């Protein structure tokens, strides 16, 4: 095609806040493209090396009653919560695994229409509430784009609610590359899922309304070729022809506790790579 390799090297982990406070929380989020495939691909061994405090997973494709038994070889993340489509089938699904149990775990966004596909887990902790999300793809041919706009609004209002109570951290596959810098080929994707003006706009609305800051882009406003997903086809990863779909968005109040927002480009196991957040809470 038009694209050859574009180099990207994630900078070293900055593990102290701007006030010099060492990070006390490490959160890892990962679209795993199937819990069972991911595990087969050694996803868990990378999790152990990373040693996060909280691990959030998206697209587990796994019924909450058919969890791989390997998920018990994680003694460090022993508190495990799962949401999968209410029809009990093998698609979508998210996970949240935690060293410490949260004060409370909830599922969905309190909207029946939007709560049947196991897309959202809310884990409330002392100083903050963590949400992980697997946002509805707009669909091939954009046949799900109208629903996705419904989804975007409900979700945006629900999050706005949470944040009014506690500092918010939202992470996961938000199924949109916000701006042109967020994907390798903006020009050819303006009509495809992930880069419609509708989706880009909803991400923008999400940021101002809650409000939320894009942790990675706040720290690296001018850094290009930083992606978290590459299609399996066309040898895309190897050419770094990708999209940034995975994010950590923070309440502005958490910005002084932001140490770094990382993209683990080399970590294999899915068509997305892990992202990792360091906070000094």
Q: Binding of Mn ion at residue 53 (CB under 5 A)? A: no
Please give the residue whose beta carbon sits closest to Mn ion in the complex: 33
* Annotation says 33 is catalytic: no
**Residues of each annotated binding site for Mg(2+):** 31, 59, 173, 175, 271-272
Distance, CA of 99 to CA of 25 (rounded, Å)? 11
Q: Are 120 and 154 in contact (CB under 8 A)?
A: no
Site for Mn ion in 142-161 (CB under 5 A): none
* Annotation says 173 is catalytic: yes
User: Based on CB atoms, which residue is closest to Mn ion, 84 or 213?
Assistant: 84
The full length of the chain comes to: 281
Scanning 20-28, 29-37, 187-195, 224-232 for contacts with Mn ion by CB under 5 A, the matching segment is: 29-37
* Annotation says 114 is catalytic: no
From the candidates 81, 107, 134, 247, which is the catalytic residue?
134
Minimal distance, residue 21 CB to Mn ion, in Å: 37
Minimal distance, residue 225 CB to Mn ion, in Å: 22
125 CB-side CA count, 13 A: 16
Q: Binding of Mn ion at residue 33 (CB under 5 A)? A: yes
User: Based on CB atoms, which residue is closest to Mn ion, 38 or 151?
Assistant: 38
User: Based on CB atoms, which residue is closest to Mn ion, 35 or 122?
Assistant: 35
Minimal distance, residue 85 CB to Mn ion, in Å: 15
**Active site (catalytic) residues:** 134, 173, 272
* Contacts with Mn ion, residue ranges (CB under 5 A): 33
């Amino acid at each position: 095609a038009s694209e050859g390799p574009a180099l990207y090297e994630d900078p070293p982990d900055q593990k102290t806040s701007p006030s010099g406070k060492p990070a006390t929380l490490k959160i890892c989020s990962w679209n795993v493209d199937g819990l069972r495939a991911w595990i087969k691909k050694k996803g868990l061994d990378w999790v152990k090396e990373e040693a996060p405090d909280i691990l959030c997973l998206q697209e587990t494709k796994c019924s909450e009653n058919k969890l791989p038994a390997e998920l018990q070889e994680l003694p460090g993340l022993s508190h495990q919560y799962w949401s999968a489509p209410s029809d009990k089938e093998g698609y979508s699904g998210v996970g949240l695994l935690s060293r410490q149990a949260p004060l409370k775990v909830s599922y969905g966004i309190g909207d029946e229409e939007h709560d049947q596909e196991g897309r959202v887990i809310v884990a409330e902790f002392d100083s903050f509430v963590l949400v992980t999300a697997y946002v509805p793809n707009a669909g091939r041919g954009l046949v799900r784009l109208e629903y996705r706009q419904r989804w975007d609004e409900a979700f945006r209002k629900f999050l706005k609610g949470l944040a009014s109570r506690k500092p918010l951290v939202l992470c996961g596959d938000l199924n949109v590359a916000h701006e042109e810098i967020d994907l390798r080929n903006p020009k050819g994707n303006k009509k495809n899922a992930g880069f419609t003006p509708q989706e880009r706009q909803g991400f923008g609305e999400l940021l101002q309304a809650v409000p939320l800051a894009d942790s990675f882009r706040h720290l690296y406003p001018n850094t290009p070729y930083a992606y978290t997903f590459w299609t399996y086809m066309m040898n895309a990863r190897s050419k770094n022809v990708g999209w940034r779909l995975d994010y950590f968005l923070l309440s502005h109040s958490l910005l002084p506790a932001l140490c770094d927002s990382k993209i683990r480009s080399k970590a294999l196991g899915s068509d997305h790579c892990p992202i990792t957040l360091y906070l000094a809470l």
